[PDB]
RNA sequence: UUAAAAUAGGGCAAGUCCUACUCUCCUUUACAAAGAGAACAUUAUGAUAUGUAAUUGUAUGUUUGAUUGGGGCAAUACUAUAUU
């Protein structure tokens, strides 16, 4: 809705330049980047794409020379894939146990107390608590946060760039 | 002699769809290595090290050829005797 600053004053949408909007949507691991990938407005984006293009069902149309040869398209595909390093987008994954049912134990937020026989656990709460020894033990499995390790995801060094 | 891309020449198992397998990429609770740290023994309750002590962890490797199975062989030969 209305964007409020630190002081609490409102900023109109005309004041925000488009470079900032592309910045928020470009920030990985955010809702804006996820909304761009999965569709910010499915009904609105479909009609927008349908109008800007030739048509939803129209194919190989002529507007009111010679087409590109197959030997050219093959050469253009090689120069795009192996020289310009242009790749296609991939999918984003989601927890299946939580996506199917949000109010189960696979999603988390269990209101039960697993530890029995203590009186301090019921008082200690909060989103961030104190855990002793995480620097040497970790959560278990994956412990580093994002953008910590090298050559992760599409930037793998096992199969090269074009393999992704 | 001049000018034209019609053919030859100048690289091409290609394009779309469906199915299946794999690679890649994510997850850790088990497999091997892990460069990080610990704890312990020894001299001191003050420092440098060596270990036969390491059962902790995070990136890395692997994780669908089961014949490494199943059969058969089963002391009391030979000549006789009795029993169920
Ligand atoms: Mg590990
Ligand atoms: Mg692994």
From TrEMBL:
Domain of life: Eukaryota
Disordered, as annotated region: 143-164
Protein name listed in UniProt: EngB-type G domain-containing protein
Species of the source: Trypanosoma brucei brucei (strain 927/4 GUTat10.1)
Residues of the full protein shown: 480 to 655 of 655
């Amino acid at each position: 809705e209305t964007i409020r600053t630190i002081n609490g004053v409102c900023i109109p949408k005309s004041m925000v330049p488009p470079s900032v909007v592309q910045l928020a949507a470009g920030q990985a691991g955010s809702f804006a980047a996820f909304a761009q990938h999965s569709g910010a407005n499915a009904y609105e984006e479909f009609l927008t794409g349908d109008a800007t293009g030739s048509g939803t069902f129209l194919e190989a149309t002529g507007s009111e020379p010679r087409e590109k040869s197959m030997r050219r398209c093959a050469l253009d595909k090689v120069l795009k894939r192996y020289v310009a390093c242009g790749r296609k987008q991939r999918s984003l994954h989601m927890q299946a146990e939580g996506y199917m049912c949000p109010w189960l134990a696979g999603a988390g937020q269990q209101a039960r107390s697993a530890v029995f026989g203590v009186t301090r656990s019921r008082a200690h709460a909060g989103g961030m608590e104190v855990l002793k020894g995480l620097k040497r033990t970790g959560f278990g499995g994956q412990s580093y946060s994002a953008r910590t390790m090298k050559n992760r995801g599409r930037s793998t060094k096992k199969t090269g760039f074009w393999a992704a």
